[PDB]
Amino acid sequence: RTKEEAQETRAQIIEAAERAFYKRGVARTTLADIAELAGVTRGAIYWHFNNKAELVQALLDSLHETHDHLARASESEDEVDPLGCMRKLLLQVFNELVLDARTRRINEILHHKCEFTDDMCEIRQQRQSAVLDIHKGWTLALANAVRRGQLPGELDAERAAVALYAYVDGLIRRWLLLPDSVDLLGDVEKWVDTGLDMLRLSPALRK
Amino acid sequence: TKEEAQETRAQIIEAAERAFYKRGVARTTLADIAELAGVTRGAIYWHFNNKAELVQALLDSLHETHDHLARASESEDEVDPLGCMRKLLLQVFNELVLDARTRRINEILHHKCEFTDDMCEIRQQRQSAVLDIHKGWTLALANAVRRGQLPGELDAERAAVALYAYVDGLIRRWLLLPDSVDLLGDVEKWVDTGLDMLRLSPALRK
Ligand SMILES: [Mg+2]
Ligand SMILES: [Mg+2]
Protein backbone atom coordinates (compact mmCIF):
# COMPACT_ATOMS: atom_id res chain seq x y z
CA ARG A 1 0.00 0.00 0.00
CA THR A 2 0.98 3.63 -0.53
CA LYS A 3 1.18 4.64 3.14
CA GLU A 4 2.95 1.48 4.33
CA GLU A 5 5.60 1.87 1.64
CA ALA A 6 5.93 5.59 2.40
CA GLN A 7 6.42 5.05 6.14
CA GLU A 8 9.11 2.48 5.34
CA THR A 9 10.88 4.93 3.03
CA ARG A 10 10.73 7.78 5.54
CA ALA A 11 12.16 5.42 8.17
CA GLN A 12 15.04 4.40 5.90
CA ILE A 13 15.80 8.08 5.24
CA ILE A 14 15.81 8.94 8.94
CA GLU A 15 18.13 6.05 9.81
CA ALA A 16 20.51 7.08 7.02
CA ALA A 17 20.38 10.72 8.14
CA GLU A 18 21.46 9.62 11.61
CA ARG A 19 24.40 7.74 10.09
CA ALA A 20 25.40 10.63 7.82
CA PHE A 21 25.06 13.44 10.38
CA TYR A 22 26.94 11.41 13.01
CA LYS A 23 29.92 10.68 10.76
CA ARG A 24 30.19 13.90 8.75
CA GLY A 25 28.09 16.52 10.55
CA VAL A 26 24.96 18.39 9.55
CA ALA A 27 26.71 21.30 7.86
CA ARG A 28 28.38 19.44 4.98
CA THR A 29 25.86 16.61 4.56
CA THR A 30 23.30 17.09 1.79
CA LEU A 31 19.93 15.46 1.22
CA ALA A 32 21.43 13.96 -1.95
CA ASP A 33 24.15 12.42 0.21
CA ILE A 34 21.54 10.98 2.57
CA ALA A 35 19.42 9.60 -0.28
CA GLU A 36 22.44 7.74 -1.66
CA LEU A 37 23.15 6.30 1.79
CA ALA A 38 19.51 5.24 2.24
CA GLY A 39 19.19 3.71 -1.22
CA VAL A 40 16.32 5.97 -2.29
CA THR A 41 15.95 8.41 -5.17
CA ARG A 42 16.48 12.15 -4.83
CA GLY A 43 12.85 12.65 -5.81
CA ALA A 44 11.86 10.41 -2.91
CA ILE A 45 13.90 12.13 -0.20
CA TYR A 46 12.76 15.58 -1.34
CA TRP A 47 9.18 14.33 -1.30
CA HIS A 48 9.48 13.54 2.42
CA PHE A 49 11.61 16.51 3.48
CA ASN A 50 12.00 19.97 1.97
CA ASN A 51 15.39 20.78 3.52
CA LYS A 52 17.95 19.51 6.01
CA ALA A 53 16.35 21.51 8.83
CA GLU A 54 13.26 19.31 8.59
CA LEU A 55 15.39 16.16 8.88
CA VAL A 56 17.14 17.53 11.97
CA GLN A 57 13.77 18.34 13.52
CA ALA A 58 12.52 14.81 12.81
CA LEU A 59 15.41 13.40 14.83
CA LEU A 60 14.93 15.99 17.57
CA ASP A 61 11.18 15.36 17.76
CA SER A 62 11.81 11.61 18.05
CA LEU A 63 13.42 11.99 21.49
CA HIS A 64 10.32 12.81 23.55
CA GLU A 65 8.19 9.79 22.61
CA THR A 66 9.69 7.40 25.16
CA HIS A 67 9.20 9.81 28.08
CA ASP A 68 5.68 11.07 27.33
CA HIS A 69 3.90 8.77 29.79
CA LEU A 70 5.97 9.81 32.82
CA ALA A 71 6.00 13.48 31.78
CA ARG A 72 2.20 13.74 31.63
CA ALA A 73 1.91 11.88 34.95
CA SER A 74 4.35 14.26 36.64
CA GLU A 75 2.41 17.27 35.31
CA SER A 76 -1.06 16.06 36.35
CA GLU A 77 -2.38 17.92 39.38
CA ASP A 78 -4.24 14.73 40.37
CA GLU A 79 -1.01 12.68 40.59
CA VAL A 80 -0.29 11.85 44.22
CA ASP A 81 3.51 11.43 43.81
CA PRO A 82 4.64 14.02 41.23
CA LEU A 83 8.24 14.16 42.47
CA GLY A 84 8.46 10.38 42.24
CA CYS A 85 7.29 10.65 38.64
CA MET A 86 10.08 13.18 38.02
CA ARG A 87 12.63 10.79 39.53
CA LYS A 88 11.45 7.89 37.36
CA LEU A 89 11.49 10.27 34.38
CA LEU A 90 15.10 11.31 34.97
CA LEU A 91 16.17 7.71 35.58
CA GLN A 92 14.62 6.78 32.23
CA VAL A 93 16.33 9.70 30.46
CA PHE A 94 19.77 8.53 31.57
CA ASN A 95 19.05 4.81 31.18
CA GLU A 96 17.93 5.40 27.59
CA LEU A 97 20.94 7.60 26.81
CA VAL A 98 23.41 4.94 27.92
CA LEU A 99 21.62 1.87 26.54
CA ASP A 100 19.99 3.04 23.29
CA ALA A 101 22.42 3.49 20.41
CA ARG A 102 19.87 5.69 18.63
CA THR A 103 19.15 8.05 21.53
CA ARG A 104 22.88 8.38 22.14
CA ARG A 105 23.66 9.05 18.47
CA ILE A 106 20.88 11.62 18.06
CA ASN A 107 21.97 13.41 21.24
CA GLU A 108 25.56 13.46 19.96
CA ILE A 109 24.34 14.99 16.70
CA LEU A 110 22.33 17.70 18.45
CA HIS A 111 25.07 18.55 20.94
CA HIS A 112 28.28 18.10 18.95
CA LYS A 113 27.56 17.73 15.22
CA CYS A 114 25.02 20.45 14.39
CA GLU A 115 25.72 24.18 14.19
CA PHE A 116 23.39 27.14 14.71
CA THR A 117 23.85 29.39 11.67
CA ASP A 118 21.58 32.15 10.38
CA ASP A 119 21.99 30.37 7.04
CA MET A 120 19.73 27.73 8.67
CA CYS A 121 17.97 29.80 11.33
CA GLU A 122 15.30 27.15 11.94
CA ILE A 123 17.66 24.80 13.79
CA ARG A 124 18.20 27.27 16.62
CA GLN A 125 14.56 28.39 16.63
CA GLN A 126 13.30 24.81 16.96
CA ARG A 127 15.84 24.05 19.69
CA GLN A 128 14.54 27.07 21.60
CA SER A 129 10.97 25.77 21.23
CA ALA A 130 11.87 22.27 22.43
CA VAL A 131 13.70 23.54 25.51
CA LEU A 132 10.87 25.93 26.35
CA ASP A 133 8.40 23.03 26.09
CA ILE A 134 10.47 20.99 28.55
CA HIS A 135 10.70 24.01 30.87
CA LYS A 136 6.92 24.49 30.93
CA GLY A 137 6.37 20.83 31.78
CA TRP A 138 9.01 20.67 34.51
CA THR A 139 7.75 23.89 36.11
CA LEU A 140 4.29 22.34 36.39
CA ALA A 141 5.65 19.10 37.88
CA LEU A 142 7.73 20.98 40.46
CA ALA A 143 4.77 23.16 41.47
CA ASN A 144 2.71 19.98 41.85
CA ALA A 145 5.43 18.50 44.07
CA VAL A 146 5.39 21.70 46.14
CA ARG A 147 1.60 21.42 46.41
CA ARG A 148 1.92 17.81 47.63
CA GLY A 149 4.49 18.74 50.29
CA GLN A 150 7.36 17.03 48.46
CA LEU A 151 9.38 20.22 47.86
CA PRO A 152 9.83 23.40 49.93
CA GLY A 153 6.73 25.56 50.06
CA GLU A 154 8.58 28.71 48.96
CA LEU A 155 10.39 27.03 46.06
CA ASP A 156 10.79 29.20 42.96
CA ALA A 157 9.38 26.60 40.57
CA GLU A 158 10.64 28.41 37.47
CA ARG A 159 14.23 28.88 38.66
CA ALA A 160 14.19 25.33 40.05
CA ALA A 161 13.18 23.97 36.63
CA VAL A 162 16.01 25.91 34.99
CA ALA A 163 18.54 24.66 37.55
CA LEU A 164 17.44 21.05 37.03
CA TYR A 165 17.57 21.35 33.25
CA ALA A 166 21.05 22.90 33.39
CA TYR A 167 22.34 20.01 35.49
CA VAL A 168 20.67 17.29 33.42
CA ASP A 169 21.69 18.79 30.07
CA GLY A 170 25.21 19.44 31.30
CA LEU A 171 25.64 15.88 32.56
CA ILE A 172 24.34 14.42 29.29
CA ARG A 173 26.85 16.45 27.28
CA ARG A 174 29.66 15.67 29.74
CA TRP A 175 28.94 11.95 29.43
CA LEU A 176 28.91 12.19 25.62
CA LEU A 177 32.30 13.93 25.65
CA LEU A 178 33.98 11.77 28.34
CA PRO A 179 31.86 8.62 28.70
CA ASP A 180 34.50 6.85 30.81
CA SER A 181 34.82 9.76 33.26
CA VAL A 182 31.31 9.03 34.57
CA ASP A 183 29.57 5.73 35.35
CA LEU A 184 26.21 7.18 34.37
CA LEU A 185 24.45 3.80 34.30
CA GLY A 186 25.91 2.13 37.39
CA ASP A 187 25.56 5.25 39.56
CA VAL A 188 22.40 6.49 37.83
CA GLU A 189 20.38 6.79 41.04
CA LYS A 190 23.14 8.90 42.61
CA TRP A 191 23.25 11.21 39.59
CA VAL A 192 19.48 11.72 39.62
CA ASP A 193 19.30 12.39 43.36
CA THR A 194 22.20 14.85 43.23
CA GLY A 195 20.07 16.97 40.91
CA LEU A 196 16.85 16.66 42.90
CA ASP A 197 18.72 17.34 46.15
CA MET A 198 19.76 20.70 44.69
CA LEU A 199 16.12 21.70 44.26
CA ARG A 200 14.71 20.53 47.58
CA LEU A 201 17.63 21.70 49.75
CA SER A 202 19.23 24.84 48.31
CA PRO A 203 17.75 27.96 49.97
CA ALA A 204 19.00 29.95 46.97
CA LEU A 205 16.14 28.38 44.96
CA ARG A 206 13.51 29.62 47.45
CA LYS A 207 11.65 32.92 47.22
CA THR B 1 59.32 42.21 14.00
CA LYS B 2 58.07 40.52 17.17
CA GLU B 3 55.22 42.99 17.69
CA GLU B 4 54.28 42.79 14.00
CA ALA B 5 53.75 39.04 14.41
CA GLN B 6 51.92 39.32 17.74
CA GLU B 7 49.64 41.95 16.19
CA THR B 8 49.02 39.78 13.13
CA ARG B 9 48.14 36.84 15.39
CA ALA B 10 45.59 38.95 17.27
CA GLN B 11 44.11 40.21 13.99
CA ILE B 12 43.67 36.59 12.86
CA ILE B 13 42.03 35.41 16.08
CA GLU B 14 39.62 38.36 16.03
CA ALA B 15 38.65 37.64 12.42
CA ALA B 16 38.27 33.94 13.29
CA GLU B 17 35.69 34.85 15.93
CA ARG B 18 33.77 36.88 13.34
CA ALA B 19 33.90 34.17 10.67
CA PHE B 20 33.09 31.23 12.96
CA TYR B 21 30.21 33.09 14.60
CA LYS B 22 28.59 33.93 11.27
CA ARG B 23 29.18 30.76 9.24
CA GLY B 24 30.21 28.13 11.78
CA VAL B 25 33.48 26.24 12.07
CA ALA B 26 32.71 23.30 9.78
CA ARG B 27 32.48 25.35 6.57
CA THR B 28 35.02 28.08 7.43
CA THR B 29 38.58 27.71 6.12
CA LEU B 30 41.82 29.36 7.17
CA ALA B 31 41.80 30.98 3.72
CA ASP B 32 38.39 32.51 4.46
CA ILE B 33 39.70 33.89 7.76
CA ALA B 34 42.84 35.33 6.18
CA GLU B 35 40.88 37.38 3.64
CA LEU B 36 38.51 38.53 6.39
CA ALA B 37 41.49 39.64 8.51
CA GLY B 38 43.31 41.17 5.54
CA VAL B 39 46.60 39.30 6.06
CA THR B 40 48.32 38.20 2.87
CA ARG B 41 51.02 35.96 1.36
CA GLY B 42 50.08 32.93 3.43
CA ALA B 43 50.76 34.55 6.80
CA ILE B 44 47.90 32.77 8.56
CA TYR B 45 49.62 29.42 8.00
CA TRP B 46 52.69 30.75 9.81
CA HIS B 47 50.57 31.33 12.92
CA PHE B 48 48.29 28.27 12.76
CA ASN B 49 48.98 24.82 11.34
CA ASN B 50 45.28 24.08 10.80
CA LYS B 51 41.78 25.20 11.75
CA ALA B 52 41.67 23.05 14.90
CA GLU B 53 44.68 24.94 16.27
CA LEU B 54 42.80 28.20 15.73
CA VAL B 55 39.74 26.80 17.51
CA GLN B 56 41.94 25.77 20.45
CA ALA B 57 43.35 29.31 20.60
CA LEU B 58 39.83 30.67 21.08
CA LEU B 59 39.08 28.13 23.82
CA ASP B 60 42.45 28.63 25.52
CA SER B 61 41.74 32.37 25.65
CA LEU B 62 38.75 31.78 27.95
CA HIS B 63 40.97 30.60 30.83
CA GLU B 64 43.10 33.75 30.97
CA THR B 65 40.83 36.01 33.01
CA HIS B 66 40.12 33.35 35.66
CA ASP B 67 43.66 32.01 36.06
CA HIS B 68 44.37 33.95 39.26
CA LEU B 69 41.30 32.61 41.08
CA ALA B 70 41.69 29.09 39.67
CA ARG B 71 45.31 28.79 40.83
CA ALA B 72 44.34 30.16 44.24
CA SER B 73 41.50 27.67 44.75
CA GLU B 74 43.97 24.88 43.92
CA SER B 75 46.80 26.00 46.22
CA GLU B 76 47.40 23.95 49.35
CA ASP B 77 48.29 27.18 51.19
CA GLU B 78 44.97 28.87 50.33
CA VAL B 79 42.88 29.10 53.50
CA ASP B 80 39.58 29.86 51.68
CA PRO B 81 39.49 27.57 48.63
CA LEU B 82 35.69 27.42 48.45
CA GLY B 83 35.54 31.21 48.62
CA CYS B 84 37.95 31.29 45.68
CA MET B 85 35.64 28.91 43.81
CA ARG B 86 32.66 31.15 44.52
CA LYS B 87 34.54 34.21 43.25
CA LEU B 88 35.66 32.16 40.24
CA LEU B 89 32.10 31.22 39.31
CA LEU B 90 30.78 34.74 39.90
CA GLN B 91 33.43 36.03 37.49
CA VAL B 92 32.69 33.36 34.89
CA PHE B 93 29.01 34.35 34.77
CA ASN B 94 29.75 38.09 35.05
CA GLU B 95 32.19 37.92 32.14
CA LEU B 96 29.84 35.78 30.05
CA VAL B 97 26.99 38.27 30.33
CA LEU B 98 29.07 41.46 30.17
CA ASP B 99 31.87 40.64 27.69
CA ALA B 100 30.98 40.49 24.00
CA ARG B 101 34.10 38.46 23.18
CA THR B 102 33.56 35.83 25.89
CA ARG B 103 29.90 35.47 24.93
CA ARG B 104 30.65 35.08 21.22
CA ILE B 105 33.44 32.57 21.82
CA ASN B 106 31.20 30.52 24.11
CA GLU B 107 28.45 30.56 21.47
CA ILE B 108 30.98 29.33 18.90
CA LEU B 109 32.23 26.48 21.08
CA HIS B 110 28.79 25.46 22.34
CA HIS B 111 26.61 25.96 19.27
CA LYS B 112 28.70 26.57 16.13
CA CYS B 113 31.54 24.01 16.19
CA GLU B 114 31.06 20.46 14.91
CA PHE B 115 33.06 17.47 16.10
CA THR B 116 33.89 15.62 12.87
CA ASP B 117 36.49 12.86 12.74
CA ASP B 118 37.78 14.42 9.54
CA MET B 119 38.84 17.08 12.07
CA CYS B 120 39.38 14.63 14.94
CA GLU B 121 41.47 17.18 16.84
CA ILE B 122 38.51 19.40 17.77
CA ARG B 123 36.89 16.67 19.87
CA GLN B 124 40.22 15.46 21.28
CA GLN B 125 41.19 19.00 22.31
CA ARG B 126 37.81 19.56 23.95
CA GLN B 127 38.23 16.33 25.92
CA SER B 128 41.67 17.39 27.19
CA ALA B 129 40.40 20.87 28.11
CA VAL B 130 37.43 19.59 30.12
CA LEU B 131 39.63 16.99 31.81
CA ASP B 132 42.02 19.79 32.79
CA ILE B 133 39.14 21.77 34.31
CA HIS B 134 37.99 18.65 36.16
CA LYS B 135 41.46 17.96 37.58
CA GLY B 136 41.62 21.52 38.89
CA TRP B 137 38.10 21.57 40.31
CA THR B 138 38.65 18.20 41.99
CA LEU B 139 41.71 19.66 43.72
CA ALA B 140 39.89 22.84 44.76
CA LEU B 141 37.00 20.88 46.26
CA ALA B 142 39.42 18.50 48.00
CA ASN B 143 41.15 21.58 49.43
CA ALA B 144 37.75 22.83 50.62
CA VAL B 145 37.11 19.47 52.29
CA ARG B 146 40.51 19.65 54.00
CA ARG B 147 39.71 23.17 55.25
CA GLY B 148 36.35 22.11 56.66
CA GLN B 149 34.33 24.08 54.10
CA LEU B 150 32.70 21.00 52.51
CA PRO B 151 31.61 17.68 54.04
CA GLY B 152 34.46 15.40 55.04
CA GLU B 153 32.88 12.47 53.19
CA LEU B 154 32.35 14.40 49.95
CA ASP B 155 33.21 12.49 46.78
CA ALA B 156 35.43 15.23 45.36
CA GLU B 157 35.48 13.80 41.83
CA ARG B 158 31.71 13.32 41.50
CA ALA B 159 31.18 16.74 43.08
CA ALA B 160 33.43 18.36 40.48
CA VAL B 161 31.50 16.60 37.71
CA ALA B 162 28.17 17.71 39.20
CA LEU B 163 29.30 21.34 39.49
CA TYR B 164 30.65 21.34 35.93
CA ALA B 165 27.43 19.85 34.54
CA TYR B 166 25.40 22.59 36.23
CA VAL B 167 27.71 25.46 35.25
CA ASP B 168 28.19 24.25 31.67
CA GLY B 169 24.47 23.58 31.31
CA LEU B 170 23.48 26.97 32.70
CA ILE B 171 25.82 28.77 30.30
CA ARG B 172 24.39 26.93 27.29
CA ARG B 173 20.83 27.52 28.52
CA TRP B 174 21.47 31.26 28.88
CA LEU B 175 23.05 31.40 25.41
CA LEU B 176 20.01 29.63 23.93
CA LEU B 177 17.33 31.52 25.91
CA PRO B 178 18.91 34.62 27.48
CA ASP B 179 15.59 36.33 28.24
CA SER B 180 14.49 33.41 30.44
CA VAL B 181 17.32 33.67 32.99
CA ASP B 182 18.48 36.95 34.56
CA LEU B 183 21.95 35.50 34.98
CA LEU B 184 23.49 38.89 35.82
CA GLY B 185 21.02 40.34 38.31
CA ASP B 186 20.60 37.00 40.11
CA VAL B 187 24.23 35.93 39.63
CA GLU B 188 24.89 35.31 43.32
CA LYS B 189 21.84 33.04 43.55
CA TRP B 190 22.75 31.04 40.45
CA VAL B 191 26.24 30.47 41.87
CA ASP B 192 25.06 29.53 45.37
CA THR B 193 22.47 27.12 43.95
CA GLY B 194 25.26 25.07 42.39
CA LEU B 195 27.54 25.33 45.41
CA ASP B 196 24.61 24.36 47.65
CA MET B 197 24.35 21.11 45.69
CA LEU B 198 27.87 20.28 46.90
CA ARG B 199 27.40 21.64 50.43
CA LEU B 200 24.12 19.87 51.17
CA SER B 201 23.35 16.87 48.94
CA PRO B 202 23.92 13.54 50.73
CA ALA B 203 24.03 11.88 47.29
CA LEU B 204 27.51 13.35 46.63
CA ARG B 205 28.98 11.77 49.79
CA LYS B 206 31.02 8.57 49.65
MG1 LIG C 1 13.24 7.36 22.81
MG1 LIG D 1 38.56 36.41 29.57
Numbering used by the authors:
A (entry chain B): 5 to 211
B (entry chain A): 6 to 211
Sentences from the paper on this structure:
To understand the structural basis of TtgR-ligand interactions, we solved high-resolution crystal structures of quadruple mutant (resveratrol-bound and apo) and wild-type TtgR (resveratrol-bound) at a resolution of 1.9 Å or better. From the enriched population, we isolated a resveratrol-specific TtgR variant with four mutations: C137I, I141W, M167L, and F168Y which we will henceforth refer to as the ‘quadruple mutant’. All four mutations were in close proximity to the ligand and no mutations were found elsewhere on TtgR. The quadruple mutant gave 92- and 6.5-fold induction with 100 μM resveratrol and 1 mM naringenin, respectively, compared to 55- and 55-fold of wild-type TtgR. The DNA-binding domains of the resveratrol-bound quadruple mutant and the resveratrol-bound wild type are extremely similar with an all-atom RMSD of 1.0 Å. The four mutations do not substantially change the volume of the pocket (215Å3 in wild type compared to 234 Å3 in the quadruple mutant) or the surface area of the pocket (184 Å in wild type compared to 186 Å in the quadruple mutant). The biological effects of these mutations are further validated by the crystal structures. The four mutations localize to one face of the binding pocket, making nonpolar interactions with the ligand.
